[PDB]
Design an enzyme around this catalytic site. Structure first.
Site, mmCIF file in Angstrom:
data_model
loop_
_atom_site.group_PDB
_atom_site.id
_atom_site.type_symbol
_atom_site.label_atom_id
_atom_site.label_comp_id
_atom_site.label_asym_id
_atom_site.label_seq_id
_atom_site.Cartn_x
_atom_site.Cartn_y
_atom_site.Cartn_z
ATOM 1 N N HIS A 74 -6.630 5.864 1.279
ATOM 2 C CA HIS A 74 -6.449 4.998 0.089
ATOM 3 C C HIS A 74 -6.978 3.533 0.212
ATOM 4 O O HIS A 74 -7.656 3.000 -0.674
ATOM 5 C CB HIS A 74 -4.975 4.971 -0.400
ATOM 6 N N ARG B 94 0.316 -0.416 -0.036
ATOM 7 C CA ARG B 94 0.701 0.631 0.922
ATOM 8 C C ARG B 94 1.547 0.218 2.158
ATOM 9 O O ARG B 94 2.437 0.943 2.638
ATOM 10 C CB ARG B 94 -0.496 1.479 1.358
ATOM 11 N N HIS C 282 2.001 3.018 4.819
ATOM 12 C CA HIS C 282 1.076 2.747 5.937
ATOM 13 C C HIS C 282 1.510 1.551 6.768
ATOM 14 O O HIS C 282 2.091 0.614 6.227
ATOM 15 C CB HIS C 282 -0.320 2.494 5.397
ATOM 16 N N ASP D 124 -3.069 0.413 10.011
ATOM 17 C CA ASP D 124 -3.848 1.479 9.360
ATOM 18 C C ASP D 124 -4.759 0.975 8.263
ATOM 19 O O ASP D 124 -5.888 1.435 8.053
ATOM 20 C CB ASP D 124 -2.922 2.506 8.668
#
Lengths: 222, 222, 222, 222, 222, 222
Positions: free
Chosen positions: C142, C175, C181, C185
């Site tokens: 993403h 995120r 995440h 990441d």
């Protein structure tokens, strides 16, 4: 590469009989780890102890060569551990120096090549007389010797086993306080130092020399 | 309070012969310390290993009672360590269980009363069948048993000493992975577990039983 | 294993044209590292932001599928990014989704198999509608999509490049705040997301579609 | 304050076209943060790498001026990137140096004025030939140049994109190993270095010079 | 917004006379900081104390309302601090509750809106009877009251000043142990709690009530 | 061992009247603790502030002797605090110097004997004119003086209480920035510095001198 076949005065064992330290031990704490953060804090703490009476002992201990560890137990043992006074004993303990110091530490030493604290910090030790190696920190061969000697001494004199083991422990701690070794090197060293005394008990010459030290100690007792 | 005089099937030694663990060991890492920060991270890491094949073994190991450690070495040892197949050996190893598990850990256990990780975290273990104690974590009596057994096994079968020692090591690591013990409890336990095998070598009954296990192993070899 | 040859609506590129993420990226922070300590603290901080207006946006962003990222830039871009209003543009951005999301992240994803924060913590996200994967956290596909889209959007509309890049940045930050995440990441993902837009500029179809989006945007300007 | 209008040999872009780094980037890790603890550990680790072959390369890389980065990719690129051998290419890459190095880093540089590691530590670098600035560490202009060059190089030679990107990555890592920059400065720099290549693709002169480098490379291929 | 003009039974001072806590205090430790790491470890440690006799006291202390702090000093003071037995004293201490609890903490409370530990952790306290606020943790109004009361009590009975101050200290520590407050909230609170007793000594009504409590205490002494 | 009976110009109180700092205070953060990690980071941060205008003030403040603290409040107070201009006030504040600096800090100082940061680090301060003690860091006697003076000054001039308290606070912070003291020494010092002003209010001579300073200040007001 040395062993009993090249240096039979300082090893009972052969290369094939060594503890595979590289196989058994965990890797040393890496830089970037919390476990290394702790090695650092243990360094700084020992560093602050340098000025104390324990600091004084650590500097003295740090002056020990492998050969002086045996006699370094005399107070814990209860009596002089010397060529003069306890020759069967002194001989036993000398003859296993490099079994513990070398054979039991070598593969991990040589593989990891770890930097010692004083070298990491670009400083000197609390000590600071030989041309200090910067490296092969993990595990500590001196601590391996001191622990392995405490284990065999504890067996000869179980009446003083606790004092003996505590002395053994402290020899390694002296290296942390003085800046020679990370706490983890010394901890790792007690593991391989124990393993090599198992192997030593399989060795005829060791067995026989140990009987002699026991007998000597016995007569010593009156 | 038990010992060989109350439970001679599970101890060779007496209360007076025990390693003074409270005296020898450092205190466990305290909450607020970096060393405890590391115990925590080692917990979380073992926790993530739970799903793996090593995780599977750790859950199995965590199912071991003190009594099942001896047989838990069979693969490392090279042959079944069982009442059926190696009775002199099985007897040796059983009879020293509480020398290592209890005598060698007691004073530090009882003094520090440390909380185990699953209890600290208010969770369960990777395992999770007895009514789990929350406490007396430091040091680990199970790890003390596994290490002490690896040391005496290594002496009986030095050909497989490395596999044996690594199994011994891993038994304790299983307790860290499964959440039963902090890494420091397991490390502390290997120190006292080594000390008690020194004492065991001073014990006539142990000596004799060890000779028998050696002889048995010998015939085993064809 | 998919690519443009299997799914030409969602990739411009082939398997052979992918960024080797496993090769380029550093390993994710390990448990036991200070860098993981930081990933944790960033988790807890995002967690505390969940109640705010930024928290609200992050929950919304966390509801985005890969397909909704393009339109998620409309406000930054200055105008609707929709099939209705900007079809050449919408098509461009859709057709590169899996170049960025998959091809550019795959080898590192599959190798490291990293656990996401909500799964690590055994909790849910700020969000929490699909059957959430626990794993392949590193890097974030993403975030790779959002960054790569911001880079190509910035090129179409340099007048709003800063707003565009900041939106792109924030999509990944959403995120982290929502618990999908680790910060690392998302950081790793911006590296591979940039690399794949270099590759996209070598691709004829991309080039042509980009010309069309530019032309569309131009007429858009009156 | 410089740009293409003052130094058209070293910028394609204007002041108005710059990435607003102060707006886009997070603040650098502060002293007192865990993220700074990590910057420190990354410093010490690079420091230990200084003695290795990677250490040797890092010292060499640290000798690079902005102008030598282009040619520093020759090995990754597969062929000499030189005025002699690849003039259209060398010109392209030179003309964007300060777009990446300056324009893309300036507002964050000047606002945060961050102290570099060697200066923080009151030591020197691994290197150590110009009169080293102590400051404007965040982000790294050298890393921004190296990353932005890797992105445009990857586009000219996608056959070697992975080697190219890895070289680009490593140029920044060299600055961390040598003590010139914190890991976070180098990470921040890859973000703005990517953003500026989006802007460069909007620039006619860049576009045309890039076509020339592509054509040159093509004939190069036989 | 309340003060002595709205609630003259619980404040001596006015809004204008308040300590500007927002101005004086440092910000609370942020998530991502080492100082917050320490707040966390202090939380976990207090948490482990919950099972002890000190844990028992902390749960009791945590049951105190602002109004019960005065009488909570009785043991430290040496005699009952009650409406029945020491009315001039009880009145003094009650009338300054919100000077310390509110006026002295308000601007920092309301600005930072900090999350309390139990809420951060999504758990309950050691306690856990009112509808617990999640927020305005920094500084602790309860600790401000307890410290400020210890300071004025120490002045009335300097013979027991040390016991009094230690009780005062511990009231705040009880909130850390029970999970109501971070260590830093309690530390911050002792700063503003001291400042408000300076202001109280400028207040005629306080002065007069303090004279009365002194006189009462005096007759108390036989 | 000194007090008002040996040095009645610098103490109002006796040895028996001192705050038992050893009893009241927590131990200082230990090496190996996270709280010490934070003391370190606060050290490094102050260290980076040394170059600023706040750094300049801290160096100046660090030049203050105990005797210069009173006049160091002049700007906060609103008017010169000098023998010339405010003699009743100057006398008050001087006569309590060692009540705060010595009596209130002594037992903890002498017990813990803590190493100061510059000495820990083997560096100098930001300052660096007397023969700097390495030791008795915890708590800071200078900070105890500055805090205790701010509390009594705040009482004389409540119109400027906030400026006064903030100056008081900052005097201690100057010692952290300059490297004289750990943040925790300065924090601990504000606790005992508050306690001693409670005791001072029980002292007839102090009371009378304080009335005089109040009266002087009053006429000062026109």
């Amino acid at each position: 590469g040395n062993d009993t076949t090249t240096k039979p005065d300082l090893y009972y064992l052969k290369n094939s009989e060594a503890i595979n330290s590289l196989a058994l031990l965990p890797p040393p704490p890496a830089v970037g780890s919390i476990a290394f953060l702790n090695d650092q804090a243990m360094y700084e703490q020992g560093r602050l102890l340098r000025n104390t009476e324990r600091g004084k002992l650590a500097a003295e201990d740090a002056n020990l060569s492998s050969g002086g560890v045996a006699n370094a137990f005399s107070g814990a043992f209860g009596s002089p551990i010397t060529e003069k006074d306890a020759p069967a004993l002194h001989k036993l303990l000398t003859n296993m120096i490099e079994d513990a110091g070398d054979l039991a530490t070598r593969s991990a030493k040589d593989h990891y090549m770890r930097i010692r604290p004083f070298a990491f910090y670009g400083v000197s030790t609390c000590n600071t007389q030989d041309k200090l190696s910067k490296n092969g920190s993990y595990p500590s061969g001196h601590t391996s010797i001191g622990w392995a000697t405490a284990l065999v001494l504890a067996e000869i004199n179980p009446q003083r086993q606790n004092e003996i083991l505590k002395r053994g422990y402290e020899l390694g701690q002296s290296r942390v306080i003085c800046g020679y070794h990370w706490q983890s090197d010394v901890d790792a060293a007690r593991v391989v130092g124990s393993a090599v005394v198992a192997t030593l008990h399989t060795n005829p010459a060791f067995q026989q020399q140990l009987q002699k030290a026991k007998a000597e100690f016995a007569q010593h007792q009156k």
